Motif scaffolding. Sequence first.
Motif, PDB file in Angstrom:
ATOM      1  N   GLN A 170      -5.216   5.677  93.946  1.00  0.00           N
ATOM      2  CA  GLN A 170      -5.828   4.308  94.618  1.00  0.00           C
ATOM      3  C   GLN A 170      -6.502   4.540  95.912  1.00  0.00           C
ATOM      4  O   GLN A 170      -5.972   4.997  96.785  1.00  0.00           O
ATOM      5  N   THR A 171      -7.819   4.021  95.785  1.00  0.00           N
ATOM      6  CA  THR A 171      -8.833   4.092  96.829  1.00  0.00           C
ATOM      7  C   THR A 171      -9.287   3.074  97.517  1.00  0.00           C
ATOM      8  O   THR A 171     -10.086   2.616  98.580  1.00  0.00           O
ATOM      9  N   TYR A 188      -7.710  -1.331  98.689  1.00  0.00           N
ATOM     10  CA  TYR A 188      -6.678  -2.659  98.718  1.00  0.00           C
ATOM     11  C   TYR A 188      -5.400  -2.225  99.227  1.00  0.00           C
ATOM     12  O   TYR A 188      -4.341  -2.863  98.838  1.00  0.00           O
ATOM     13  N   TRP A 189      -5.231  -1.180  99.932  1.00  0.00           N
ATOM     14  CA  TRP A 189      -3.820  -0.595 100.300  1.00  0.00           C
ATOM     15  C   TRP A 189      -3.103  -1.846 100.902  1.00  0.00           C
ATOM     16  O   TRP A 189      -3.511  -2.081 101.885  1.00  0.00           O
ATOM     17  N   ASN A 190      -1.799  -1.544 100.668  1.00  0.00           N
ATOM     18  CA  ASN A 190      -0.685  -2.432 101.343  1.00  0.00           C
ATOM     19  C   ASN A 190      -0.526  -2.011 102.867  1.00  0.00           C
ATOM     20  O   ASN A 190      -0.260  -0.917 103.235  1.00  0.00           O
ATOM     21  N   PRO A 191      -0.665  -3.096 103.798  1.00  0.00           N
ATOM     22  CA  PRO A 191      -0.624  -2.697 105.216  1.00  0.00           C
ATOM     23  C   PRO A 191       0.652  -2.282 105.841  1.00  0.00           C
ATOM     24  O   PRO A 191       0.647  -1.674 106.743  1.00  0.00           O
ATOM     25  N   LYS A 192       1.676  -2.101 105.074  1.00  0.00           N
ATOM     26  CA  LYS A 192       2.968  -1.414 105.451  1.00  0.00           C
ATOM     27  C   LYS A 192       2.956  -0.027 104.825  1.00  0.00           C
ATOM     28  O   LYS A 192       3.916   0.863 105.185  1.00  0.00           O
ATOM     29  N   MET A 193       2.440   0.414 103.876  1.00  0.00           N
ATOM     30  CA  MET A 193       2.115   1.635 103.204  1.00  0.00           C
ATOM     31  C   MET A 193       0.762   2.484 103.823  1.00  0.00           C
ATOM     32  O   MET A 193       0.984   3.814 103.746  1.00  0.00           O
ATOM     33  N   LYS A 194      -0.133   1.946 104.134  1.00  0.00           N
ATOM     34  CA  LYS A 194      -1.290   2.692 105.116  1.00  0.00           C
ATOM     35  C   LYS A 194      -1.004   3.730 106.023  1.00  0.00           C
ATOM     36  O   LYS A 194      -1.690   4.609 106.060  1.00  0.00           O
ATOM     37  N   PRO A 195       0.291   3.407 106.810  1.00  0.00           N
ATOM     38  CA  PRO A 195       0.684   4.614 107.583  1.00  0.00           C
ATOM     39  C   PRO A 195       0.990   6.017 107.103  1.00  0.00           C
ATOM     40  O   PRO A 195       1.041   6.947 107.805  1.00  0.00           O
ATOM     41  N   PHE A 196       1.326   6.084 105.748  1.00  0.00           N
ATOM     42  CA  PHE A 196       1.714   7.174 105.094  1.00  0.00           C
ATOM     43  C   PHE A 196       0.655   7.912 104.497  1.00  0.00           C
ATOM     44  O   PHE A 196       0.742   9.160 103.974  1.00  0.00           O
ATOM     45  N   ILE A 197      -0.860   7.680 105.022  1.00  0.00           N
ATOM     46  CA  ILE A 197      -1.965   8.549 104.687  1.00  0.00           C
ATOM     47  C   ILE A 197      -1.857   9.638 105.650  1.00  0.00           C
ATOM     48  O   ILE A 197      -1.756   9.381 106.951  1.00  0.00           O
ATOM     49  N   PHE A 198      -2.379  10.670 105.216  1.00  0.00           N
ATOM     50  CA  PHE A 198      -2.535  11.933 106.147  1.00  0.00           C
ATOM     51  C   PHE A 198      -4.185  12.325 106.205  1.00  0.00           C
ATOM     52  O   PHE A 198      -4.649  12.153 105.226  1.00  0.00           O
ATOM     53  N   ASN A 206     -13.005  13.717 104.942  1.00  0.00           N
ATOM     54  CA  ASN A 206     -13.544  12.645 105.168  1.00  0.00           C
ATOM     55  C   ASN A 206     -13.477  11.572 104.017  1.00  0.00           C
ATOM     56  O   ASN A 206     -13.963  11.806 102.912  1.00  0.00           O
ATOM     57  N   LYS A 207     -13.129  10.084 104.359  1.00  0.00           N
ATOM     58  CA  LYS A 207     -13.152   8.991 103.223  1.00  0.00           C
ATOM     59  C   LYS A 207     -12.091   9.215 102.057  1.00  0.00           C
ATOM     60  O   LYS A 207     -12.344   8.697 101.029  1.00  0.00           O
ATOM     61  N   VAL A 208     -11.142  10.434 102.195  1.00  0.00           N
ATOM     62  CA  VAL A 208     -10.374  10.777 101.000  1.00  0.00           C
ATOM     63  C   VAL A 208      -8.889  10.390 101.331  1.00  0.00           C
ATOM     64  O   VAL A 208      -8.225  10.319 102.363  1.00  0.00           O
ATOM     65  N   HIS A 209      -8.384   9.370 100.364  1.00  0.00           N
ATOM     66  CA  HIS A 209      -6.971   8.890 100.334  1.00  0.00           C
ATOM     67  C   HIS A 209      -5.955   9.809  99.750  1.00  0.00           C
ATOM     68  O   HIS A 209      -6.184  10.227  98.432  1.00  0.00           O
ATOM     69  N   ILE A 210      -5.042  10.212 100.362  1.00  0.00           N
ATOM     70  CA  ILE A 210      -3.923  10.908  99.858  1.00  0.00           C
ATOM     71  C   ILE A 210      -2.747  10.528 100.747  1.00  0.00           C
ATOM     72  O   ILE A 210      -2.598  10.493 102.033  1.00  0.00           O
TER      73      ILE A 210
END
Length: 109
Positions: A11-12, A14-24, A28-32
């Motif tokens: 998923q790249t 529309y991320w949920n505002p309470k799950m966004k802080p778990f991104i590391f 550059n521009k990579v979701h994980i």
Amino acid sequence: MLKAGVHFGHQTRYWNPKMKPFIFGARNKVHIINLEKTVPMFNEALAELNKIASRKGKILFVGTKRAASEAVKDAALSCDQFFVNHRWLGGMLTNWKTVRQSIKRLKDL
RNA sequence: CUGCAUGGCUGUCGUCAGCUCGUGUUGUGAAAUGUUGGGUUAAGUCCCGCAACGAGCGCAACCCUUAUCCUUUGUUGCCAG
């Protein structure tokens, strides 16, 4: 070893505002997602599930996807437990005394 | 003597496919949801599915008769042998 598990990352948008802080921060521009709290947060919740089991609470399991719909009726069969695997109703749990007439119907047929 | 005094009894919009109810939801509430949607029909009929799941009155079947056959009783009727 601290568990932790599988990531792609998937998923790249529309991320949920309470799950966004778990991104590391890796690329550059990579979701994980970081999962280094999965079992550490479960070890403290399974302590209150133990408190509900101590209170003899009736446990309900739910699934519809092919990995879960078969497992809710086989993977916990070492205890007494209840499940829903595919089909749902209006007031499925919140109108149980009406829904009981469909269990009398099931057993009559 | 008269159906704004009645009980009853029958017409008609209407043999049309409609009108309601128990619990749950929705709104401050009268109520709305269920009866809608999607297929199907003679039909709120049946099927599929959903915040509904089941019900009552209508509905429909049983009921009765009819087109073909088999069999039982036959006169003062009938007349094939």
